[PDB]
């Protein structure tokens, strides 16, 4: 077995080590060819056809790039080829746990079908990785290339999900702590996964990317920080880092949280909910599973991809009809109609226990305008979106270590006031989108009245089209003026 | 209703007329989201995830661009909004008839599964267009926006497939002959479909395009040629046109006819053949169909996409195991192994009646070298590829009309010697690829001996790696070295 | 005379009207081929070789694009071909007044060599436009193409510089008010000039921006506001607009205000000043002019370009050597050394009256570290840069008119709290860079001590490398520690 | 001191070794900022503003990339950091010898001003390199970083011009022969200089590049052929190589030999000739030199750039008026008029001794058209352009060594017949362009009659617009029809 070269539109010609090749050429990895990166985003951005497979390749590639650069500019770190391979494998495999339409599955479907469980694509990734290793006899191949499976498999899993349960990792000691900052950076969110999806998503969406990850890699070092060895960025690049998160936020505003893309995610999820009792995926031994239970058997999960959509679509079985028509309403583009967007004011925050109580509030909303058709709770959809810099209310740049030209291994910290005052004052907010599931002209009018009224009463922000869509309501007392 | 804007990575923001939108928002059109543009090419070029849907949008857009530009520079052509709409619709819909993995279906599967019948993706497109119109009540929508359904549907179909069988067209008179040169150009192959897949395939493959379609549009005029009004290119642009076809040829050499991509198309095709008796697709009124017979009922064809692959992959049914097994060997990357490439010499040409006659020919030849293994007809695959400039042995530029700066309304002709002596001397050739279905080291050695000997016996060209893979055979051949 | 087609790397093939062609082919316009867009920026970003010529072509092109799009979507605006031509000419010619190395000249040189006069590149553009027209007989050509010279020339000049003297314009009436918002938008700064230099500068710098001007153009309308017809943007596009200005700020941080690029602009300016008594430039009747006084005669200004640099570089006369030597220290890369950066912390701002008093203060700070050299003001350079959103402390988006999907003809306003809470709270700030003109190790050490001490004494922000370059000074103030 | 990072739009962030930096920061190298890569090309393609400086940086970068890659895939070659540095330096410096407007200077001006001499930009590069070394005291710097000035300077010069005169090189032994194939490949022309100008010129022209140099680097090896060590390409990449030269030819057709670009080069050259008596350039020790004699003293040549153009343009000395007005006729776009293009037929070729007799041949021709204006020899320009694949009549791919995957280290040859039948049959041809120095309508008409008649008389190819520009002449010739 020899090295393979693969041509990627984003990174160009990528070299894949034979071990990476044997990991890639498995049913568990090839599965990612049938899972769309941005899910329902494709039904809004027609270029967004790319899948988790190529993304995974890109993440592995960039992980290798960064670890290799660090290794070559600072030999005293003793980064081994074994380290490089493990970091590449973690990069390659940290998307293994995604389900149909990616985030829709873990962010929308599973929380509704099985509110029981705490499931994330990360855990799915460790489980699926274990399953890949075991089902494909990769351990002797790992050994063949100088890896020690019991130490290194642990290292990889820890890279993907963090500590498997004050140095909490058992795959690598603290003098190699920086190796844990590459694939999934739990301390500030700056990792190679973001870099690849910036470049790739922008390539396919038709939006252009302004973050230069190659530059970051060029300016990256390893420093001592509180007796740990961590990745330090050159000081003057701090601005770029802010821009990075700005970029992330922008991509969420323009594409990932697109109103119609989101309502399509919602409709698809709902169809999955109405199909969850009649669609079956056969797992280990021959035992049978459903969409919501596929996550409990990795052999079953292996056969759970975007294909389920088409299965629901092409079915003839009557028991699936409630599902099958929903998808068809997507095909005819008869979608739930968008009513508007608003935000909480002051210190008010929307808790996740109170979401189901939100359409019903809107349905209750006070009249004021002459009434026609009247809509109920089930006719309204309320979607709450949390926009942040990846670390709740916190500024992630406060958790970045920097170095100076004068003393390149002396780590320093940089506060927001040392960079710019045009920077954000907050790093978290919520957006509330309201849609109406009945689509005729005056049901839409009514829904608009209900919505604007509801915004006024909870003292939310004034809807941008407020003066137009509800001229009789927005005049009501005037701190919307 | 009103205009829609769509963001395409290739063309930017595209405006879609409400009628185009109503055509697009049908299951017949949306079907194309599930058919890969380059089919098995995706399994070699990981960026090639794009589907026929986005390509179709692009072709429709470019058709609109060209017809509009011609109309705007030459008002005396009297191009109507109606004409523009018909050309856009034809552009949008000329890909409707493609089947699973695109060219794999009409180029490989159907010819083996249904050798009696005459099937093309063009005819499929016409049929599917008819079915779309009728199933979705598009005629009244057409009338609503100023179209005359009985002439215009004819016009559109003729744009897609040509004269339905003097002036052979019934959709438009001869003074608008140029309108038939835009979407599918039967006269020289220069059309907007090519331009779009040049740009899009290059965007996704990671290979770059050197053809400037925008420049061509800028320099395009309509002039009179043989009592018709046809599209003429500015004289000095003739070089670009040659480059265009060179580009096409190049794209086939690098990507579309990639050895491994083709072998994967072949394996998928074989799997489809071995699954064709057990896979059922529900058509009109409930009648059931097979993969090879789905093309006879458009309601069934509507649900025949790339999905069929995954069905075969995910099945449990024992009657499908021989099919399913082939697919799984694709997942494990256990592919038929490439033995070599060669070409006929002189005037010898291989017709499709002789294709089935080729493995038996390769196995019968025997080289003066001691072997080990002996191979049969079934162990060989022989793939014949016709590389040309789109008009077989002809020079397509001999079928292009040009105009000069001094007299922009006078069409002229340009010969190859008036352009360059560095141009191709022939415009068609055939490539012969040979693969072996046994993958062990020694079946492979044997297969290489059989292959090089066979090349010698038919006086084909010397395989490029000839001296290395068969050192005992290549000197005994003096029409080489 | 016919349309000319020109190939630009940014916009592709652009069509130039014969009148535009006649304006371009004059020494006054062709002059711009010899003035670099980013000046000394080229000495930091080696790709930034582009000149004001190609930029001007781009601005003219985009001006035409916007006016034409508006005219075609809203025929009721009565936009004439004459209007389109005047807007194109204004776009083409608003950069005519730039001097050697662009913004270095009017922003740094003229304020120092001739502090008496109020000079801008805008006024220079009006003057040079007049000179182009009169010196090249363009008025009869204008009439030849349906323009009315004395109203339209007025219109063009007003587009470039604003009102020449309530409706303040005499070139066009209020029902054509929107035409004044295209080439140079004095009301919120959103114009096609920005759009071209974003794309072009990014193309050459090798840094990239995410602003889509084509999308904006697609969503642009004309609405009635107070008493005029002004350009309206679609409501939901407001986010993009914020991003636009963010982009601009980013572009200033990364490239236009690069510490070294700025110090090189400073050195070139000083050389020009020390040369400002011996270089002589031929004027109107033979009268002779010099670099600072060339702006008083357009015939002389026509011959004032970047060339002056090389002339000073290649000269032999001793009265020029203090100049010629400065330039050579640029060639040997013996530049003034960068000492550090800081900012004010309250609401009082370093006024432009206090700049000359800033180096002396740096000399005034007493650092209690033992030094070996001590420096006075001449060895320090203090550069103060105003970073804003183009409208002082104000939010330019507060000056943008929007429209809604439901009522495209009703202009509305959108406030910051209505978009996001992650936006900037102020829209203006200042950067303070300090350099040292003596470059040996000990003057640099000393200068850093002086600088950090000066930061301490004035309660400015902590230099990012503060603890590293001056560890003995920095503990003195508990809020850095 | 230390490494610098520089951001290039083509290659991204490039690392510069301190020695390279000290070579770059000299007047001899910085000189290249003022010499346009494509000369008069900028006056046709407005994006083509880039200079020889950034191109040189790109060539050094790619030279480094290739030598590094070879060193890392095959350690047994014993490539040292010293080798890498010497190759990078040669890459950086092989453009030092270009004069004003690049190829205009050595291709047009010098051959006319001094037909005597054997001058090339290569020899200029060696002389200027010597002058840089000596004038800037870089030898102790070379020694400081482990280079041996006598052998290494020899090596670099040999890389630029070839053997300074068995094994003809004395800079490096035969086991390092492959190192001579990187910067200037005298054996087949495949070198990094080409790769960089493909990418950069395409970036700036608005033409897109279709050669993948990174791919080539990935598939490049060193093999033994004729007891020498040469760079080998992977066999299956041979098609790409043909495409490479095709690309080159294409770039010459579209941009480098553009009719108007070439005529502008011609006019600038004539201006240089008529100025050749009055501009004075001070050389070594106050000795003074001419534009045509600057090449004999490197101190003078150092101060000979594109600036010369502007000097002539801005001059007031009456003795320069003949030059000065010519340049002005460029500014007003009053150019020599393009009459037409033709080529020799059969195997007859035009020698350079016969170039001077060709306008007289055109003026002597008698066309049977009624004329009143008739033109003489001095009114015609005949430009003969040699288009080839870089090796005169030879196929350069016949001089490329290949390897097969089965024996990656055994060199082989591949003939044209083993690749395609669609390839060029000849690899050299000539283009003959005719221009007229009188630009009026009737002189242009006359010039066209003379030209087509001259083509008929020499049995050249029929001009593409022949039937249009000279309808009374072209029927006379029945090898035209
Ligand atoms: N001419 C080409 N230009 C650009 N990319 C190419 C070209 N040919 C193939 N590719 C792409 C497709 C793949 O993603 C990647 C590898 O291609 P390729 O070299 O053909 O691998 P291969 O496995 O088929 O050949 P082999 O096993 O004989 O080395 O490069
Ligand atoms: N901010 C953006 N930048 C670039 N592209 C965008 C942006 N927002 C959306 N797109 C893309 C996605 C779609 O393919 C296309 C349409 O966008 P969009 O304006 O959101 O249509 P829409 O139908 O959702 O809005 P609406 O119906 O209210 O007019 O443009
Ligand atoms: N083959 C090409 N591809 C892309 N751009 C080109 C090509 N040839 C020329 N260009 C560019 C250069 C110019 O900027 C622009 C116009 O060139 P061109 O069409 O040749 O004008 P022209 O004035 O010399 O020809 P003519 O006067 O005969 O119409 O396009
Ligand atoms: N934020 C940026 N993004 C992209 N490119 C940049 C950015 N800043 C600078 N560049 C470019 C300009 C230069 O060509 C190259 C080097 O920039 P830079 O790192 O600022 O050099 P420098 O010499 O000024 O820094 P240093 O302080 O280390 O000496 O990168
Ligand atoms: Mg391979
Ligand atoms: Mg919409
Ligand atoms: Mg022309
Ligand atoms: Mg530096």
């Amino acid at each position: 077995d020899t090295m393979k070269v693969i041509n990627d539109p984003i990174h160009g010609h990528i070299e894949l080590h034979p071990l990476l090749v044997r990991i890639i050429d498995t049913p568990q990895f090839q599965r990612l060819r049938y899972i769309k990166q941005l899910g329902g985003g494709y039904y809004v951005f027609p270029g967004a056809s790319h899948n988790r497979f190529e993304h995974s390749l890109g993440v592995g590639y960039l992980a290798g790039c960064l670890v290799h650069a660090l290794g070559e500019k600072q030999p005293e770190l003793q980064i081994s080829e074994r380290d490089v391979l493990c970091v590449q494998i973690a990069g390659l495999c940290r998307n293994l746990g995604h389900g149909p339409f990616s985030h829709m599955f873990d962010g929308r479907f599973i929380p509704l079908a099985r509110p029981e469980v705490k499931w994330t694509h990360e855990q799915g990734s460790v489980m699926m990785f274990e399953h890949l290793i075991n089902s494909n006899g990769i351990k002797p191949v790992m050994e063949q290339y100088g890896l020690i499976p019991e130490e290194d498999i642990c290292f990889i899993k820890e890279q993907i999900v963090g500590p498997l349960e004050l140095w909490p990792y058992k795959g690598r000691p603290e003098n190699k702590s920086f190796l844990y900052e590459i694939v999934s950076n739990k301390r500030n969110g700056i990792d190679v996964d973001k870099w690849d999806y910036f470049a790739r998503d922008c390539h396919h969406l038709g939006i252009q990317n302004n973050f230069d990850y190659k530059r970051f890699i060029k300016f990256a070092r390893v420093c001592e920080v509180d007796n740990e060895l961590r990745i330090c960025a050159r000081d003057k690049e701090v601005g770029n880092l802010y821009d990075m998160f700005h970029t992330r936020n922008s991509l969420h505003r323009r594409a990932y949280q697109h109103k119609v893309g989101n309502i399509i995610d919602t409709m698809i999820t709902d169809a999955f909910l109405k199909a969850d009792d009649y669609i079956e995926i056969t797992g280990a031994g021959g035992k049978k599973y459903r969409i919501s239970t596929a996550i409990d058997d990795m052999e079953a999960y292996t056969k759970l991809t975007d294909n389920i959509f088409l299965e629901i679509l092409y079915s003839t079985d009557p028991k699936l009809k409630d599902a099958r028509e929903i998808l068809k309403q997507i095909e005819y583009r008869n979608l739930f109609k968008y009513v508007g967007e608003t935000q909480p004011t002051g210190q008010i925050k929307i808790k996740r226990e109170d979401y189901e109580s939100l359409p019903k509030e809107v349905a209750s909303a006070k009249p004021k305008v002459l009434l026609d058709v009247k809509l109920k709770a089930e006719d309204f959809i309320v979607d709450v979106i949390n926009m942040d810099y990846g670390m709740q209310e916190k500024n992630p740049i406060d958790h970045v270590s920097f170095y100076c030209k004068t003393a390149p291994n002396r780590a320093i910290r940089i506060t927001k006031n040392q960079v710019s005052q045009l920077l954000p004052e907050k790093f978290a907010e919520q957006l509330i989108r309201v849609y109406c599931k009945k689509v005729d002209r005056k049901s839409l009018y009514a829904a608009r009245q209900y919505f604007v009224q509801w915004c006024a009463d909870r003292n939310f922000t004034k809807p941008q089209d407020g003066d137009v869509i509800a001229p009789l309501i927005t005049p009501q007392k005037k701190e919307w003026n």
Side-chain angles (χ1 to χ4, degrees), chain A residues 274-465:
Chain A
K274 284 76 168 300
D276 194 30
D277 295 330
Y278 317 107
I279 295 282
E280 94 194 353
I281 307 93
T282 89
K287 183 163 149 181
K288 289 214 182 324
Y289 289 90
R290 295 166 6 192
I291 300 170
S292 58
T293 63
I295 67 171
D296 291 309
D297 182 34
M298 288 304 114
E299 195 173 319
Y301 200 52
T302 294
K303 314 178 28 178
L304 186 69
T305 62
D306 292 10
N307 167 256
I308 265 55
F309 177 95
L310 287 182
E311 205 167 332
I312 295 172
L313 188 68
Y314 296 156
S315 65
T316 44
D317 182 56
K319 340 189 182 307
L320 281 173
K321 146 137 166 160
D322 293 272
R324 177 173 53 250
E325 260 286 323
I326 286 166
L327 298 194
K328 302 186 168 312
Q329 293 317 306
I330 296 176
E331 281 202 310
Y332 288 107
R333 210 75 178 181
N334 296 321
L335 311 174
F336 302 154
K337 298 305 289 189
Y338 172 79
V339 179
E341 194 185 51
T342 194
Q343 306 170 79
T345 46
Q347 230 65 60
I348 285 177
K349 202 144 36 161
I350 307 301
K351 174 45 181 52
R352 165 159 329 155
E353 277 205 276
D354 303 344
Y355 284 5
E356 184 186 338
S357 79
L358 289 172
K360 158 183 139 241
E361 290 186 10
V362 180
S364 298
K366 28 177 186 72
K368 326 313 168 201
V369 296
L370 313 207
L371 315 178
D372 199 304
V373 297
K374 310 143 26 166
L375 235 34
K376 55 211 336 183
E378 301 72 47
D379 307 324
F380 284 101
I381 285 180
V382 174
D383 199 22
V384 175
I385 308 299
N386 287 326
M387 306 287 284
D388 57 27
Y389 271 27
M391 293 182 49
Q392 60 176 65
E393 283 171 295
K394 297 312 158 192
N395 183 349
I397 310 301
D398 287 334
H399 296 78
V400 180
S401 291
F402 296 90
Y403 74 88
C404 308
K405 184 185 181 182
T406 306
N409 308 190
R410 182 173 328 169
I412 68 164
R413 294 262 192 210
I414 303 179
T415 68
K416 195 166 78 79
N417 303 277
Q418 303 184 262
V419 179
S420 181
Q421 188 61 62
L422 269 49
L423 293 175
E425 103 173 78
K426 323 181 188 289
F427 296 91
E429 71 183 344
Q430 295 184 295
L431 282 47
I432 292 83
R433 283 88 171 270
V434 173
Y435 310 80
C436 182
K437 304 180 19 166
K438 302 193 158 329
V439 300
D440 57 280
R441 303 290 183 189
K442 273 165 11 184
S443 290
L444 190 55
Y445 179 90
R448 297 176 177 165
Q449 315 320 301
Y450 283 106
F451 168 71
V452 179
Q453 192 65 55
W454 179 66
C455 289
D457 294 352
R458 295 206 53 170
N459 215 32
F460 291 163
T461 53
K462 178 189 179 185
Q464 282 168 12
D465 54 350

Side-chain angles (χ1 to χ4, degrees), chain A residues 215 219 234 236 240 405:
Chain A
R215 181 174 172 87
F219 288 39
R234 165 82 184 270
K236 66 179 244 297
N240 294 334
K405 184 185 181 182

Side-chain angles (χ1 to χ4, degrees), chain A residues 44-46 207 254 258-260:
Chain A
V44 175
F45 293 83
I207 298 171
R254 299 175 179 178
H258 190 270
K259 47 181 200 188
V260 178

Side-chain angles (χ1 to χ4, degrees), chain A residues 2-5:
Chain A
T2 63
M3 153 275 280
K4 291 201 179 303
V5 175

Side-chain angles (χ1 to χ4, degrees), chain A residues 208-219:
Chain A
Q208 194 99 21
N209 174 29
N210 64 34
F211 178 70
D212 195 337
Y213 64 87
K214 286 185 204 179
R215 181 174 172 87
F216 184 93
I217 292 182
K218 275 269 177 297
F219 288 39

Side-chain angles (χ1 to χ4, degrees), chain A residues 52-63:
Chain A
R52 290 269 155 192
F53 176 80
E54 46 267 42
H55 171 59
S56 299
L57 295 187
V59 179
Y61 168 68
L62 292 183

Side-chain angles (χ1 to χ4, degrees), chain A residues 15 17 19-20 59-72 78-92 145 147 152 155-156 159 172 176 178-179 182-183:
Chain A
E15 283 185 24
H17 187 282
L19 171 62
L20 308 184
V59 179
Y61 168 68
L62 292 183
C65 282
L66 181 49
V67 63
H68 190 78
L70 293 175
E72 285 302 332
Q78 270 331 105
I79 294 163
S80 60
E81 166 194 355
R82 169 164 168 244
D83 292 331
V84 173
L85 275 165
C86 293
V87 170
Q88 284 180 306
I89 292 175
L92 267 184
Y145 293 103
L147 271 65
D152 286 337
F155 180 35
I156 294 165
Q159 287 179 76
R172 289 297 189 279
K176 292 177 172 195
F178 58 94
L179 289 187
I182 297 176
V183 168

